[PDB]
């Protein structure tokens, strides 16, 4: 079991030959590429390099794959030294990876000569000035749609029609207050104008995404176009249900699920998220914490249901009791554990500001305990943006 | 900036949901969404006045949502502040 | 443990001096010491019902001081614990 000496700029190391010939394509490993650097005089291979890596090196051999980085050793210093070494792809990849490194995609257009032109300024902003213009345009049309929908629930808008005082129930006006505008091919409402001209190109958005991009099978996966689907859904989902519905009974009940697409338009918000960094990063960082999101959530439960339980048998003996029921309670607690405590709800007796001033203060633990967690994911993911 | 852009999200989102859960009660506390603006950051701050509240079950989910979720939005961003500082 | 302790001489010793502070005035919300222990633990933990508030200067300059002293007191013990956990 001949022996090898490899001198790191002074540092000396040995070992076994068979424990560098176990793996032949590395530089050591390798009789024809170490060559150069032997040292006939002394009997040992002389490198003129970092010192504080060649144990990790050394030791990848010994262990029989295991490449750690030495933690007094900098990312850079000790990559370069696995690529001087010529340890290989893999070694590299599984080093990376441990390392909290994992990237790899890029979907280029199908080489289109238009294909690739139209995605380009469509995903890419910083492809050229134009690229640019219509990303700036989609932050406007987004801000313009929220502020729109916001200003149809305005009093001095809404509360001027043709049953303002009281009078009357006319049909076009009780679906004009349902949904927020008013849909006719008059296009009188301005509201209606608005919110349809913001719809026609969060549509043209979509459909330009949908036909540029190079695959259409890894396109509903994308939340980002999730996103922009969701963002037109209701619009539609809205004309089909008016036109399918034009009477006074007929609207009256379909009037809860055209209310529930009402609501769900403010999902458009999240239109921004394409062109926010940081609203990017938010999303990783839950999507990373579910684990904790969930525990919070669920230790508040078991919270609320604890301390909800015990007002309300604690104030059920008086004239004057604020909780009807451990149910209604629910709403007392989550406000006293977050520490909200509007005051719309509170306890009048002993045993019920006992039982509060417990709340409170397992409330602060309870949301104490998993936020941090969440903080640090977030933490994590936003420098290593940064 | 990020603090007062999520901060904003919120705001709006809760707002939107609160004002329409309350919508049909003649005892509602929201006139209008920009209106509830004012209810929404003083629940996710967790102030908590006690002006404008919610009466309805719809209204109480969000509220509760939303104070949960003010929690772990000014929580994100405030640290790297509170090191800078220190 | 130290969290109940500490909270338990805050809560004294703020409901002492408000309770004083509020005790020569007709409307005066604190109707003895003890009574005040709820206005006290509502305030450093800053849930702030609305419920019991001084209304004399001396009894605001009391209630400014006790809200800090509660997020100054429960901030103390409170990261061990978070530690432990995590
Ligand atoms: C509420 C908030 C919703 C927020 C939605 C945010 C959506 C964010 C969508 C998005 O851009 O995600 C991409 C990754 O996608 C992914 O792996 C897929 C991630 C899906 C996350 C889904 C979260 C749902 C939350 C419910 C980013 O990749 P990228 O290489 O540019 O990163 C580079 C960076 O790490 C700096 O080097
Ligand atoms: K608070
Ligand atoms: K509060
Ligand atoms: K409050
Ligand atoms: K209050």
Redesign the pocket.
């Known amino acids: 079991s001949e022996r090898v000496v490899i001198n790191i700029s002074g540092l000396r190391f040995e070992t076994q030959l068979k424990t560098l010939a176990q793996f032949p394509e590395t530089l050591l490993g390798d009789p024809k590429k170490r060559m150069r650097y032997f040292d006939p005089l002394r009997n040992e291979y002389f490198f003129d390099r970092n010192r504080p890596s060649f144990d990790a090196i050394l030791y990848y051999y010994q262990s029989g794959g295991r490449l750690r980085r030495p933690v007094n050793v900098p990312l850079d210093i000790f990559s370069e030294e696995i690529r001087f070494y010529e340890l290989g792809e893999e070694a590299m990849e599984m080093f990376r990876e441990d390392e909290g490194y994992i ?1 790899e995609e890029e979907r280029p257009l199908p080489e289109n000569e238009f294909q690739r032109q139209v995605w380009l300024l469509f995903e890419y902003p910083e492809s050229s000035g134009p690229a640019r213009i219509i990303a700036i345009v989609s932050v406007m049309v987004i801000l313009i749609s929220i502020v729109s929908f916001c200003l149809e629930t305005l009093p001095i808008f809404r509360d001027e029609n043709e049953d303002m005082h009281g009078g009357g129930v006319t049909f076009h006006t009780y679906s004009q207050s349902t949904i927020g505008y008013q849909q006719s091919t008059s296009f009188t409402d301005p509201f209606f104008i608005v919110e349809t001209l913001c719809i026609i190109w969060f549509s043209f958005e979509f459909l330009v995404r949908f036909f540029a991009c190079p695959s259409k099978a890894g396109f509903f996966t ?3 176009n999730i ?1 922009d689907i969701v963002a037109i859904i209701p619009y539609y989902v809205t004309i089909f249900l008016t036109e399918s519905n034009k009477s006074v009974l007929q609207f009256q009940n379909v009037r809860r699920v055209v209310q529930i697409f009402r609501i769900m338009r403010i999902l458009r918000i ?1 239109k921004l ?2 062109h ?2 940081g ?6 960082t ?2 990373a914490s579910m684990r904790e999101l969930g525990l919070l959530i669920f230790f508040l439960f078991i919270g609320v249901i604890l301390f909800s339980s015990a007002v309300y048998f604690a104030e059920a003996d008086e004239r004057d009791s604020q909780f009807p029921s451990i149910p209604d309670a629910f709403w007392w607690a989550v406000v006293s554990m977050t520490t909200v405590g509007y005051g719309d709800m509170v306890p009048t007796t002993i045993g019920g500001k006992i039982v509060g001033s417990l709340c409170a203060i397992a409330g602060v633990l309870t949301i104490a305990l998993p936020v941090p967690v969440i903080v640090s994911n977030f933490n994590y ?1 936003y420098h ?2 940064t």
């Open positions: 990237k994308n939340i980002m996103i999240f998220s394409r926010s960094k609203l990017q990063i938010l999303g990783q839950l999507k993911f290593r943006e």
